Scaffold this active site. Structure first.
Site, PDB file in Angstrom:
ATOM      1  N   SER B  76       0.867  -1.161   0.000  1.00 36.90           N
ATOM      2  CA  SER B  76       0.000   0.000   0.000  1.00 36.90           C
ATOM      3  C   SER B  76       0.910   1.218   0.000  1.00 36.90           C
ATOM      4  O   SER B  76       2.104   1.090   0.276  1.00 36.90           O
ATOM      5  CB  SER B  76      -0.943  -0.008   1.180  1.00 36.90           C
ATOM      6  OG  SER B  76      -0.259  -0.281   2.402  1.00 36.90           O
ATOM      7  N   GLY B 114      -8.384  -7.209   5.044  1.00 32.98           N
ATOM      8  CA  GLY B 114      -7.465  -7.341   3.922  1.00 32.98           C
ATOM      9  C   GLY B 114      -6.053  -6.950   4.356  1.00 32.98           C
ATOM     10  O   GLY B 114      -5.447  -6.040   3.799  1.00 32.98           O
ATOM     11  N   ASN B 138      -7.855 -13.340   2.824  1.00 32.88           N
ATOM     12  CA  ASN B 138      -8.408 -14.442   2.052  1.00 32.88           C
ATOM     13  C   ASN B 138      -7.290 -15.391   1.609  1.00 32.88           C
ATOM     14  O   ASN B 138      -7.547 -16.360   0.895  1.00 32.88           O
ATOM     15  CB  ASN B 138      -9.243 -13.914   0.887  1.00 32.88           C
ATOM     16  CG  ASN B 138      -8.459 -13.077  -0.102  1.00 32.88           C
ATOM     17  OD1 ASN B 138      -7.333 -12.646   0.172  1.00 32.88           O
ATOM     18  ND2 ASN B 138      -9.037 -12.816  -1.265  1.00 32.88           N
ATOM     19  N   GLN B 142      -0.733 -15.732   3.472  1.00 32.25           N
ATOM     20  CA  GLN B 142      -0.627 -14.497   4.235  1.00 32.25           C
ATOM     21  C   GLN B 142      -0.866 -14.773   5.716  1.00 32.25           C
ATOM     22  O   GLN B 142      -0.129 -14.270   6.563  1.00 32.25           O
ATOM     23  CB  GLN B 142      -1.549 -13.398   3.711  1.00 32.25           C
ATOM     24  CG  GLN B 142      -1.060 -12.816   2.390  1.00 32.25           C
ATOM     25  CD  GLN B 142      -1.958 -11.745   1.821  1.00 32.25           C
ATOM     26  OE1 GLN B 142      -3.137 -11.613   2.181  1.00 32.25           O
ATOM     27  NE2 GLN B 142      -1.385 -10.957   0.923  1.00 32.25           N
ATOM     28  N   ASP B 164     -12.903 -14.758   2.944  1.00 32.24           N
ATOM     29  CA  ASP B 164     -13.410 -13.759   2.020  1.00 32.24           C
ATOM     30  C   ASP B 164     -14.312 -12.820   2.819  1.00 32.24           C
ATOM     31  O   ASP B 164     -15.346 -13.232   3.346  1.00 32.24           O
ATOM     32  CB  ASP B 164     -14.124 -14.442   0.861  1.00 32.24           C
ATOM     33  CG  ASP B 164     -14.763 -13.529  -0.177  1.00 32.24           C
ATOM     34  OD1 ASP B 164     -14.868 -12.309   0.080  1.00 32.24           O
ATOM     35  OD2 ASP B 164     -15.158 -14.053  -1.241  1.00 32.24           O
ATOM     36  N   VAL B 165     -13.888 -11.556   2.957  1.00 32.44           N
ATOM     37  CA  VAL B 165     -14.605 -10.631   3.817  1.00 32.44           C
ATOM     38  C   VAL B 165     -16.065 -10.508   3.378  1.00 32.44           C
ATOM     39  O   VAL B 165     -16.929 -10.255   4.216  1.00 32.44           O
ATOM     40  CB  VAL B 165     -13.930  -9.250   3.908  1.00 32.44           C
ATOM     41  CG1 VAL B 165     -14.070  -8.478   2.603  1.00 32.44           C
ATOM     42  CG2 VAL B 165     -14.477  -8.439   5.075  1.00 32.44           C
ATOM     43  N   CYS B 310       4.790  -1.142 -11.320  1.00 28.38           N
ATOM     44  CA  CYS B 310       5.494  -0.096 -10.588  1.00 28.38           C
ATOM     45  C   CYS B 310       5.790   1.109 -11.481  1.00 28.38           C
ATOM     46  O   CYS B 310       5.636   2.251 -11.052  1.00 28.38           O
ATOM     47  CB  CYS B 310       6.809  -0.613 -10.014  1.00 28.38           C
ATOM     48  SG  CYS B 310       6.560  -1.807  -8.680  1.00 28.38           S
TER      49      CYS B 310
HETATM   50  C1  LIG Z   1      -3.521  -3.761  -1.915  1.00 25.54           C
HETATM   51  S1  LIG Z   1      -3.511  -5.042  -0.675  1.00 25.54           S
HETATM   52  C2  LIG Z   1      -3.337  -4.069   0.843  1.00 25.54           C
HETATM   53  C3  LIG Z   1      -2.877  -5.063   1.889  1.00 25.54           C
HETATM   54  C4  LIG Z   1      -2.561  -4.438   3.250  1.00 25.54           C
HETATM   55  N1  LIG Z   1      -3.763  -3.794   3.851  1.00 25.54           N
HETATM   56  C5  LIG Z   1      -1.411  -3.429   3.119  1.00 25.54           C
HETATM   57  O1  LIG Z   1      -1.675  -2.227   3.330  1.00 25.54           O
HETATM   58  O2  LIG Z   1      -0.277  -3.883   2.822  1.00 25.54           O
HETATM   59  C6  LIG Z   1      -5.279  -5.471  -0.546  1.00 25.54           C
HETATM   60  C7  LIG Z   1      -5.494  -6.806   0.145  1.00 25.54           C
HETATM   61  O3  LIG Z   1      -6.899  -7.142   0.184  1.00 25.54           O
HETATM   62  C8  LIG Z   1      -7.009  -8.545   0.167  1.00 25.54           C
HETATM   63  N2  LIG Z   1      -8.352  -8.904  -0.271  1.00 25.54           N
HETATM   64  C9  LIG Z   1      -8.912  -8.637  -1.494  1.00 25.54           C
HETATM   65  N3  LIG Z   1     -10.144  -9.071  -1.605  1.00 25.54           N
HETATM   66  C10 LIG Z   1     -10.419  -9.655  -0.375  1.00 25.54           C
HETATM   67  C11 LIG Z   1     -11.563 -10.299   0.134  1.00 25.54           C
HETATM   68  N4  LIG Z   1     -12.689 -10.455  -0.559  1.00 25.54           N
HETATM   69  N5  LIG Z   1     -11.506 -10.774   1.403  1.00 25.54           N
HETATM   70  C12 LIG Z   1     -10.370 -10.606   2.100  1.00 25.54           C
HETATM   71  N6  LIG Z   1      -9.237 -10.018   1.719  1.00 25.54           N
HETATM   72  C13 LIG Z   1      -9.322  -9.553   0.460  1.00 25.54           C
HETATM   73  C14 LIG Z   1      -5.904  -9.021  -0.770  1.00 25.54           C
HETATM   74  O4  LIG Z   1      -5.515 -10.338  -0.442  1.00 25.54           O
HETATM   75  C15 LIG Z   1      -4.789  -8.005  -0.493  1.00 25.54           C
HETATM   76  O5  LIG Z   1      -3.845  -8.528   0.428  1.00 25.54           O
HETATM   77  C1  LIG Z   2       2.017  -7.110  -8.251  1.00 28.33           C
HETATM   78  O1  LIG Z   2       0.874  -7.292  -7.409  1.00 28.33           O
HETATM   79  C2  LIG Z   2       0.457  -6.238  -6.649  1.00 28.33           C
HETATM   80  C3  LIG Z   2       1.345  -5.632  -5.766  1.00 28.33           C
HETATM   81  C4  LIG Z   2       0.929  -4.563  -4.995  1.00 28.33           C
HETATM   82  C5  LIG Z   2      -0.368  -4.083  -5.091  1.00 28.33           C
HETATM   83  C6  LIG Z   2      -0.708  -2.919  -4.196  1.00 28.33           C
HETATM   84  C7  LIG Z   2      -1.904  -1.990  -4.495  1.00 28.33           C
HETATM   85  C8  LIG Z   2      -1.714  -0.978  -5.597  1.00 28.33           C
HETATM   86  C9  LIG Z   2      -2.524  -0.955  -6.736  1.00 28.33           C
HETATM   87  C10 LIG Z   2      -2.315   0.028  -7.703  1.00 28.33           C
HETATM   88  O2  LIG Z   2      -3.070   0.070  -8.837  1.00 28.33           O
HETATM   89  C11 LIG Z   2      -1.314   0.983  -7.499  1.00 28.33           C
HETATM   90  O3  LIG Z   2      -1.055   1.949  -8.406  1.00 28.33           O
HETATM   91  C12 LIG Z   2       0.295   2.422  -8.377  1.00 28.33           C
HETATM   92  C13 LIG Z   2      -0.537   0.960  -6.358  1.00 28.33           C
HETATM   93  C14 LIG Z   2      -0.747  -0.017  -5.416  1.00 28.33           C
HETATM   94  C15 LIG Z   2       0.091  -0.021  -4.175  1.00 28.33           C
HETATM   95  C16 LIG Z   2      -0.853  -0.282  -2.991  1.00 28.33           C
HETATM   96  N1  LIG Z   2      -2.023  -1.162  -3.282  1.00 28.33           N
HETATM   97  C17 LIG Z   2      -3.284  -0.403  -3.245  1.00 28.33           C
HETATM   98  C18 LIG Z   2      -1.269  -4.686  -5.958  1.00 28.33           C
HETATM   99  C19 LIG Z   2      -0.859  -5.763  -6.744  1.00 28.33           C
HETATM  100  O4  LIG Z   2      -1.747  -6.342  -7.598  1.00 28.33           O
END
Ligand SMILES: C[S@@+](CC[C@H](N)C(=O)[O-])C[C@H]1O[C@@H](n2cnc3c(N)ncnc32)[C@H](O)[C@@H]1O
Ligand SMILES: COc1ccc(C[C@@H]2c3cc(O)c(OC)cc3CCN2C)cc1O
Ligand SMILES: C[S@@+](CC[C@H](N)C(=O)[O-])C[C@H]1O[C@@H](n2cnc3c(N)ncnc32)[C@H](O)[C@@H]1O
Ligand SMILES: COc1ccc(C[C@@H]2c3cc(O)c(OC)cc3CCN2C)cc1O
Ligand SMILES: [Cl-]
Ligand SMILES: [Cl-]
Lengths: 335, 335
Positions: B76, B114, B138, B142, B164-165, B310
């Site tokens: 994130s 998540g 999910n 993790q 799954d939330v 990225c």
């Molecule tokens: C962009 S990542 C952010 C993860 C974490 N909160 C962070 O800030 O590093 C979004 C997360 O949502 C989880 N996720 C997506 N859909 C989900 C669902 N239906 N139920 C639970 N987790 C879910 C994914 O596995 C992923 O790890």
């Molecule tokens: C390679 O897999 C992944 C690795 C990290 C993510 C993170 C996701 C994400 C999704 C984007 O479209 C984005 O725009 C720049 C930035 C980020 C960083 C934080 N977060 C909201 C998603 C993936 O699908």
């Protein structure tokens, strides 16, 4: 130049329209500089501070009003389809717009809060014969005018509550509550919306129309020491201009269903029409006012105030082709 | 040039970084043209249409993740105070920011929805020894990673729900619910917020952090036939970018208390740091992936995908010095 100097020339009719418009435009320009922040981060910080601060908080004869305003004496932004749309037509068009957006249907109970001279109340009552329409106003003169008009129009479905809405207690509920350009005067917004919600059922809708700026909120008050205008128009700190989105943060007790804005050129055309009509009927207006005011000087004072309000409103709402100050509308249901 | 042609050159490493950045920047530019309307009237019409439409609706080995992401494998946007702030420092700074804004206090029950690789869960658990911190994910991988880290860090106040939330049913409530960059994946927002509210009491707070555009909402999907990028990154139509204000219209079941945005340069620096770290550890990464992927070509494919994500994210979030796409944060209580 001090405030006194400009106020002197204004009251003597020594400032021409072009200079007057220019001076007021500049004051509004300074407000824009005050309100716009360099980043969205800062804009939201500014806007939320304002929103948090909110959560801690003689009458003109009808004959004069008839000579300055449109046919139903609407005292809110109207809606102008064409370049040639008259103020009378624009009043009706705006009434129609409210009926659509508030989803008025025949047979509903309808409350209009701060109903003014009752143009909307009379419009709904005439168009929807099975509706029961209540206007609420703090002015006895306004109540009396509405009831007389209802009698003249053979309407049997109109009543008027004489009340300060902030003090009014009732168990009664309504299918539709309308608030047209009254919320700017509300000292306590959170409590206002809460009170309205207690007058709704699960089936009710609440429609609010308010003057706004698209981006930020502000009190209608002096921007600096050079601003003679703001305190001239509103000698009290009693008027708040919410941003177009400010009411989204007031959903403790109601929930948003829809959200619109109307470009500021409509308001601009409204105040322009009032200004032109007053100018046309100037001699008549001075005659009407003289009895109740006592002197020609006091008459000139009241006229200067109203005329300057219109000239200033023109510059405000027409700024950047209506894309600064404008009108916001929201539709809500009860939680 | 067809999609096939550009995809061909990309996969072969035939597109240099400058051309790649330029191509993706142009795609985002087209999205801006699509999203910005000429008047606020039209902007709100566009935005409300989107909001109304919403209301009708193999895993990488941890060793690879450790080689691309920061120390806690935060996935994130992070927060960079200085030009020299490291990704590890930026992870911690963002964890700290969430704790402040969500008003975390020792002794609270905390749910992180998540939770990813659990950086925030572990941060809160370590800083507030009397908090009981639950991560919900999910992904079994993790969950397993978080529980191992908690064991290694001598933490006794961590649990993880594997769910799954959208399907998870529980009577349990929490003092604090955190949603960090998960809402973009939620197919059903109104139902999501409703479900969260059933896991709150009158004393609870809900904190949401989401990727946004300041002005408009959009699905992360092809802008036209020339857009090879959007569907490459997300081969499913599963990602929504809400405007910075979109969640204000989702207050059926929760009520807003505060609202912020974080300038997009922080996200830009985040994805840049990941890209640079992956580049630095490229040989190692290819070695780690080879067992589980089966061929060097399949390894190159996964790496190209992540690296392009990225590079594209950099152009997106850095657009106009971070003042287009950015991160929105909101704090809510239950109705
Ligand atoms: C962009 S990542 C952010 C993860 C974490 N909160 C962070 O800030 O590093 C979004 C997360 O949502 C989880 N996720 C997506 N859909 C989900 C669902 N239906 N139920 C639970 N987790 C879910 C994914 O596995 C992923 O790890
Ligand atoms: C390679 O897999 C992944 C690795 C990290 C993510 C993170 C996701 C994400 C999704 C984007 O479209 C984005 O725009 C720049 C930035 C980020 C960083 C934080 N977060 C909201 C998603 C993936 O699908
Ligand atoms: C700008 S006028 C709009 C009037 C009318 N709705 C219209 O569109 O013509 C606002 C009205 O709110 C009324 N008002 C202001 N404060 C009020 C209060 N506390 N209780 C009741 N009416 C109030 C004023 O009397 C005024 O008529
Ligand atoms: C002269 O007395 C008055 C006459 C009419 C009003 C109307 C009030 C108003 C207030 C403004 O600041 C404004 O900016 C242009 C426009 C309007 C028109 C509609 N409505 C929201 C207020 C008065 O105080
Ligand atoms: Cl108003
Ligand atoms: Cl998100």
């Amino acid at each position: 130049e001090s405030i006194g100097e400009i106020m002197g020339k204004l009251m003597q009719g020594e400032i021409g329209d072009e200079e007057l418009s220019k001076r007021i435009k500049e004051i509004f320009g300074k407000r824009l500089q005050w309100g716009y922040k360099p980043t969205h981060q800062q804009q939201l910080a500014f806007n939320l501070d304002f929103i948090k601060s909110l959560k801690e908080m003689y009458e003109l004869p009808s004959a004069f009003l008839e000579a300055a305003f449109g046919k139903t004496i609407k005292q809110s932004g109207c809606y102008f389809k064409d370049e040639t749309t008259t103020i009378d037509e624009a009043e009706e068009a705006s009434h129609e717009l409210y009926c659509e957006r508030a989803q008025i249907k025949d047979g509903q109970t309808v409350l209009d809060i701060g109903c003014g001279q009752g143009g909307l109340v009379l419009h709904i009552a005439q168009k929807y014969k099975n509706c029961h329409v209540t206007g609420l106003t703090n002015s006895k003169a306004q109540k009396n005018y509405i009831l007389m008009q209802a009698e003249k129009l053979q309407l049997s479905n109109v009543d008027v509550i004489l009340a300060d809405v902030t003090k009014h207690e009732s168990d009664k509920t309504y299918d539709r509550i309308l608030v047209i350009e009254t919320i700017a005067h509300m000292k306590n917004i959170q409590l206002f919306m809460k009170k309205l919600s207690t007058w709704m059922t699960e089936d009710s809708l609440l429609f609010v129309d308010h003057i706004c700026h698209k981006t930020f909120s502000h009190h209608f008050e002096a921007i600096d020491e050079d601003d003679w205008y703001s305190g001239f128009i509103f000698p009290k700190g009693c008027v708040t201009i919410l941003s177009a989105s400010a009411l989204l943060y007031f959903q403790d007790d109601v929930t948003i269903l829809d959200h619109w804005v109307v470009n500021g050129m409509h308001m601009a055309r409204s105040v322009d029409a009032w200004r032109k009509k007053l100018d046309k009927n100037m001699e008549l207006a001075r005659e009407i006012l003289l009895p109740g005011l006592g002197s020609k000087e006091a008459v000139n004072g009241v006229i200067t105030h109203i005329r300057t309000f219109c000239m200033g409103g023109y510059e405000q709402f027409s700024y950047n082709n209506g894309e600064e100050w404008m009108v916001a509308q929201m539709l809500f249901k009860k939680k």
